[PDB]
Design a binder for this molecule. Structure first.
Ligand SMILES: Cc1cc(C)c(NC(=O)Nc2cc3ccccc3cc2C(=O)N[C@](C)(C(=O)O)C2CCCCC2)c(C)c1
Ligand SMILES: Cc1cc(C)c(NC(=O)Nc2cc3ccccc3cc2C(=O)N[C@](C)(C(=O)O)C2CCCCC2)c(C)c1
Ligand SMILES: *Cc1c(COP(=O)(O)O)cnc(C)c1O
Ligand SMILES: *Cc1c(COP(=O)(O)O)cnc(C)c1O
Ligand SMILES: CC(=O)N[C@@H]1O[C@H](CO)[C@@H](O)[C@H](O)[C@H]1O
Ligand SMILES: CC(=O)N[C@@H]1O[C@H](CO)[C@@H](O)[C@H](O)[C@H]1O
Ligand SMILES: Cn1c(=O)c2c(ncn2C)n(C)c1=O
Ligand SMILES: Cn1c(=O)c2c(ncn2C)n(C)c1=O
Lengths: 805, 811
């Protein structure tokens, strides 16, 4: 088995890379290994498809504009049971497998939580044997690579396909046309959408192997191509060369991921992406349905929602609803009511945020020009929707305004969330607190009519990538005590509760953490030229840079610690390495300022000789999935400090819990449920809760009162305001200060005192290894709920109506 | 050739079947139950490429170990066609692969037709490069081809309402199983910026950078151990307003290798074209220098790398002036980067480069505006000026009284907008300059660059073009290849001169029959193709009269067309008279901006509609415009041909290579004494070709006197009828004035004197008709043509370059 892996490796280096070992590159070796590994799942990949054809299980289609997949090599080795053998084979060839793994580019086709949920789900659905496909866009450039230059974020193109992707297979025989612009004619043979521009969607298939089973599912991502055929409407002259160059304009549709996290930008190219992935995906689903054993019978499509479920990852693919209607009515000649019944039973919608700047509201003018037939269909859905509300509440005219899919205020906009609610048989939030707000407040008018529609499905993370892969030390240690059933049923981690008084096991737990810390410290000293204190608490905040996630609040605490040290250098101080990391959306000015502040603080703290090894600050550059795997297992304190009510769930919070970090955080999103499972006393909960925030909004938030009432806050803010951290540019952080005092929607100062006292309690506990690791163990033992396997089981039972196999 | 019989032969087929099935499973990721013909083609291509990896690696090892002088064919074009069949044959695997595919239940022909042409060329220039690579591989020379990996080759041509329309040749849509990317050899290329003159010397600063990423395609030799390489460069944006627009604008850098400029024998001075030329030249020279430094002949001394041995290790052939920037680029690297003195660097440059001239037509000549070059390549403009100055100084020293000679020999044309004459740059920067046939090389030497060759008589040479007898006989015409093998053995494939041995069968009627049958079999096959693509009933006993080449005023498809109408008019005039029936096929792409060429296509299709549908004509005469003429199609139609039309005006066609393909494939030639036609006449005997019309002195005499087209129109009744028909709307009844531009050119601006050769052409055609009625006499002449075609093997051509230009030896 080791011997055969070596032969296979050498075959690929030879035949696939056309390389003698004498001129072989590190990248060649990565590619030879990658192909060797992929060969081992082809059999099951082809047989998984046969199985789905022969037995016709209901299929699940996860439709997302993002899949934040990270690297595939190590994950595939783990899920196929080949890691130990591949490591040994590569070692025997005089090579280091970790070095080959670092060659691989992240498939960074996502922004943050939403896209990473899609990735974990694919892994969970494959492990649970569901007939599930992921459908998205193969962006030529994913989320940008982040560099820091002079303390500022700078963006470089994520050219991830430069050298090829060995994990994908293009299937141009399954290419599909997508239409744009044109016009509508309502003829006597039906409605015709004509004079359209066509863009081709070419699918690329990546295998999604289950963990130690016979399932290999598919992720199918679409790529834009210009069509080749001459239309008699191209008779119209132009330069030949420019016409060929202008093919770029069609191909631009799948060129780059929009790097906005929780923020809507109403750009036309983005709308095209949304319809692009949706039109190609639905056509492909219909083609597979018709070619299946339920493809003939009276109309073939009566069995459709028994054979197809399509999950909408946020409102980004909301156009799927009117497109399915369009295909049913205009092309398949089904009557409206029938089509509409089938549409609702096919689609479910997942809501990921209640922040108003994230909500998709497309101007009707833009949709009219680009997708005239879909506007007509949307207007019709709304008409029949509003007729019913006038029928049920004749006197309530304002309710019609609130429940319409169209917002009429001057420039008219389509509310895509309302489209997703009326077009779906089920709508879910991603944590209890969030799903509650969704149902009872934000879509109150919709839930009162249809209470059974709105559900909760709390998020989760795959314990393959986020334990087995990223933290083998912990995985091995856990498996040695309670066996390895926990991988496929993470609720088994509760059996670790037995070892709470096992002092030898607590030393061994702490040692695994220590080894993870040593190794990441090396990474940090290689990359940042900063001397790391090995016995310091690794205090880590990693996530996209946002005002609501409040990296800024963390930063105020960093300066507070700094100042305390300067005031009394002889005083006892629990040493920390504070790591803050994450990308700012390029056009997000305040996020970019916060980054600059953090790097400005770090430079002052890291180089102050009075501080030395007590406090080091690192801005972690280019935070992404594969770096997430490095830092999270090395963490002691997980910062999850969003203002109560703002973070729908979080998922990084769960990753840290699973890898032996304690959480400091607000009662927000999934933090509440982490407290529920682990016991509130075993997290470091602080600050305002959702009701306390509501009470401060009512009363009116005055930031100045806290700055005057809290001496340590004043010195921190003054240092920032008067140039202590930017001596050559004293006024550099003016935009931040202004925001804090006059426009802070997230109430940083209001939680500052509570946050700082909480941080003191964390330091106390860190001085007591037995107490700390006793608490860590209760966290790990209670983390089973947050496996995405549990999540998918609930989606399967209560929404998709499908069964693990 | 590898065996399919025995214990070992059975195991060869078995192994090919297993490999086929491995690739369909592991590479294509397809069960047989959902596999398509395209999947089967790829599975086979992968299998076939696998079989040359061993030799490809060993060839590179041998070149590293024995360190011979390396040859670098540098071209903007490689018109390669399809690779699958050509590789199987050259590897000796066709019989075995055929057998494997057959046993798997598949149609080998159907799999072969799936393959896209690598149509990265316009015509003869691109195709000569292609033939040359095959020959250099077969002769065992350490040669690389260097080009651009165009995302789109020459456009696919379709005909709509009688006009050419262009569609993008999206040849990489389904991938390319032959190439291998080599990311580690990615190189930077610089553009724009400016020149700084400082204490440390000249710096080229503020440049925008474009990345060149090479892709390698194997070039297998015929039945030897050599697999050489074609390295083609692809343009990429470097990883270093609106973020999204910044990402989208990476397209601008990648546009450098997006599309092939579809001009044949015509200079279009576009900035994107200039970029392409510098791109391929900069990437290539860097990569060549890198290979030189890393080899056993790469030594070190006080300054740095000794490039003393560079010209004994490196020969670079410039295929036309397109990569002329190679000369100042090498000088830039030598002087600006490697710090060699100008004198030494200039001497090494001359010893390294050789230049091949392919056309004397003024409109084809590359003359780049100094303003464009200054903006794009400012340091290269300085180097060109410096080269020119030192070049003029020597001429002033030698000929002090001749003020005009300086003007004529300058690399700069100074009137109006100043332009860089790239041919002059190539002559002074190279130690050898060659034309592509005797007639043409003589014009290059004694007339066009008379001042240059007088100063350096040993510089100018001839190297008459050739074609590879692999693709253009063994591959395209297995029937004829087989027949020749039966009669004289298989040694002709490696020594084409052995075709003269076929003279033993001169009076042998059995063999003359056998030769006719092969031609008939090729005609029957090609007739099928024709009848499924065009609404025509092909007469199978008709003479196949073919003119396939790019549409040009100088190649005179129009003349062919005038003769077609003449024939039509003769049938109408005397319906019951004896007519030797013909299928007249004319095919070729027009450059998209070539107005007159497009009009000529419209004329031909318009004429075809009349002739094909006139019931009085019937099966006597059919006209086909063959759509989308390209290499793989040339391989179908050439073997099916009886008469080859090579009717360019005397002195315009530098060589021609189609002429050679037709000769080798059993067709007789009607043509002028132009290009290699002269040498075809020399080899076969002039009486065995149908030579007609003005020769080069006759065209000179007519130019001096002045050409009055109307004198021929008035003097020749039959021409009058033809021209009046076209002018008055006989062929465009719904648009009577449609061909007004053609008439206007023919009468007042015809640089190629169509009417001047009409009389001699039509009379010559009558003689061809007469001979075709006598099978015994017709095929006797065919035999003397095939038997005399050995000279035109590209092997012969390459040995001559090697011995006289590159100073390397066949192995
Ligand atoms: C164009 C090309 C073709 C092939 C087939 C390869 N891959 C190889 O494996 N090439 C080589 C294999 C060797 C095996 C033994 C000894 C020497 C070998 C050299 C090569 C090779 O390609 N040579 C280089 C890369 C070359 O450029 O020819 C070499 C020149 C001498 C200095 C070291 C680099 C490759 C890579 C390319
Ligand atoms: C996404 C994907 C994955 C794979 C692994 C393949 N390649 C296959 O070989 N797929 C199939 C193998 C089968 C083997 C036996 C019986 C049925 C099989 C079906 C497939 C298959 O994937 N079928 C298609 C392509 C499917 O996508 O379900 C189906 C689509 C509708 C038209 C008829 C073909 C492929 C091709 C894709
Ligand atoms: C887990 C993950 C996220 C989500 O992080 P949150 O703290 O829940 O917002 C974002 N980016 C990457 C790379 C991740 O792995
Ligand atoms: C050989 C060839 C040519 C060159 O033909 P000429 O008659 O010499 O101009 C042009 N196009 C193709 C496809 C060829 O194979
Ligand atoms: C728009 C968006 O990405 N929302 C995010 O979705 C993920 C996955 O549900 C949540 O963990 C997170 O709280 C939420 O902010
Ligand atoms: C610029 C160009 O493509 N010239 C062409 O070159 C080929 C190959 O040398 C000749 O056969 C042909 O006569 C000539 O027109
Ligand atoms: C104001 N603003 C932005 O401008 C922005 C953003 N995310 C991306 N962008 C551009 N967020 C979250 C934001 O609040
Ligand atoms: C005038 N003209 C052109 O304009 C042209 C051309 N080949 C391409 N083009 C555009 N030729 C040969 C030509 O004579």
């Amino acid at each position: 088995n080791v011997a055969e892996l070596k032969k296979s490796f050498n075959r690929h280096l030879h035949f696939t890379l056309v390389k003698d070992r004498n001129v072989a590159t590190t990248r060649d070796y990565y590619f030879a290994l990658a192909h060797t590994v992929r060969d081992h799942l082809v059999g099951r990949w082809i047989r998984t498809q046969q199985h789905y054809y022969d037995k016709c299980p209901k299929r699940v289609y996860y439709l997302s504009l993002e899949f934040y997949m990270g690297r595939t090599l190590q994950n595939t080795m783990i899920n196929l049971g080949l890691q130990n053998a591949c490591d040994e084979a590569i070692y025997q060839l005089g090579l280091d497998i970790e070095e080959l793994e670092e060659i691989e580019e992240d498939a960074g086709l996502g922004n943050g939580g939403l896209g990473r949920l899609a990735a974990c789900f694919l892994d969970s659905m494959a492990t649970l044997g569901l007939a599930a496909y992921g459908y998205g866009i193969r962006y030529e450039y994913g989320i940008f690579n982040q560099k820091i230059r002079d303390g500022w974020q700078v963006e470089e193109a994520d050219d991830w396909l430069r050298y090829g992707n060995p994990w994908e297979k293009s299937r141009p025989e399954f290419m599909l046309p997508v239409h744009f612009y044109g016009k509508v004619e309502h003829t006597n043979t039906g409605t015709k959408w004509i004079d359209t521009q066509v863009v081709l969607a070419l699918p690329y298939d990546t295998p999604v192997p289950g963990y130690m089973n016979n399932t290999v599912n598919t992720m199918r991502l679409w790529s834009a191509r210009a069509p080749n055929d001459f239309n008699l409407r191209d008779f119209n002259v132009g330069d030949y060369i420019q016409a060929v160059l202008d093919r770029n304009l069609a191909e631009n549709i799948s060129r780059v991921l929009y790097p906005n996290d929780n923020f809507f930008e109403g750009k036309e190219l983005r709308l095209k992406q949304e319809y692009f992935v949706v039109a190609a995906t639905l056509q492909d689903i219909i083609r597979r349905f018709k070619a299946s054993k339920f493809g003939s019978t009276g109309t073939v499509f009566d069995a459709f929602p028994d054979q197809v479920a399509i999950q909408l990852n946020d409102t980004h693919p909301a156009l799927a609803i009117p497109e399915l209607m369009r295909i049913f009515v205009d092309i398949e000649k089904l009557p409206w009511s029938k089509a509409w019944e089938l549409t609702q039973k096919t689609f479910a919608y997942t809501n990921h945020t209640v922040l108003p700047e994230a909500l998709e509201r497309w101007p009707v003018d833009l949709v009219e020009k680009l997708l005239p037939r879909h506007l007509e269909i949307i207007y019709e859905i709304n008409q029949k929707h509003l007729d019913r509300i006038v029928a049920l509440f004749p006197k309530d005219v304002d309710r019609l305004r609130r429940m319409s899919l169209i917002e009429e205020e001057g420039s008219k906009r389509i509310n895509m969330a309302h489209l997703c609610i009326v077009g779906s048989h089920a709508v879910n939030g991603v944590a209890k607190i969030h799903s509650d707000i969704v149902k009872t407040k934000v879509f109150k008018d919709f839930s009162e009519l249809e209470p059974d529609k709105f559900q909760n499905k709390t998020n989760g993370i795959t314990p393959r990538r986020w334990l087995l892969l990223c933290n083998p030390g912990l995985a091995e240690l856990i498996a040695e005590k309670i066996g390895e059933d926990y991988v496929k049923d993470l609720s088994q981690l509760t059996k670790l509760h037995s070892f709470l008084g096992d002092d030898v096991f607590l030393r061994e737990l702490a040692k695994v953490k220590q080894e993870n810390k040593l190794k990441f410290s090396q990474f940090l000293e290689t990359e940042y030229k900063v001397k790391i204190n090995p016995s310091s608490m690794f205090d880590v905040q990693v996530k996209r840079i946002h005002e609501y996630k409040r990296q800024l609040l963390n930063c105020l605490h960093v300066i507070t610690m700094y100042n305390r040290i300067k005031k009394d250098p002889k005083k006892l101080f629990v040493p920390r390495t504070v790591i803050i990391g994450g990308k700012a959306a390029p056009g997000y000015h305040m996020a970019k300022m916060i980054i600059k502040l953090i790097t400005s603080v770090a430079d002052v703290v890291n180089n102050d000789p009075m501080v030395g090894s007590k406090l080091k600050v690192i801005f972690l550059e280019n935070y992404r999935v594969s770096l997430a795997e490095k830092v999270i297992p090395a963490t002691d304190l997980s910062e999850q400090i969003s203002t109560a009510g703002t973070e729908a769930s979080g998922t990084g919070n769960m990753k840290f819990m699973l890898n032996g970090a304690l959480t400091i955080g607000t009662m927000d999103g999934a933090n509440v449920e982490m407290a529920e499972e682990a016991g509130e006393e075993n997290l470091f909960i602080f600050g305002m809760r959702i009701d306390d925030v509501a009470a401060l909004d009512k009363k009116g938030y005055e930031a100045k009162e806290y700055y005057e009432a809290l001496p340590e806050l004043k010195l921190v803010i003054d240092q920032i305001d008067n140039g202590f951290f930017s001596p050559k540019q004293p006024d550099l952080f003016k935009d931040i200060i202004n925001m804090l005092f006059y426009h802070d929607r997230f109430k940083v100062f209001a939680d500052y005192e509570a946050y700082v006292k909480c941080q003191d309690k964390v330091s106390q506990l860190y001085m007591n290894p037995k107490a700390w690791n006793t608490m860590v163990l209760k966290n790990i033992a209670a983390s089973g709920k947050f496996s995405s396997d549990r999540t998918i089981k609930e989606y399967a039972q209560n929404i998709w109506n499908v069964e693990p196999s």
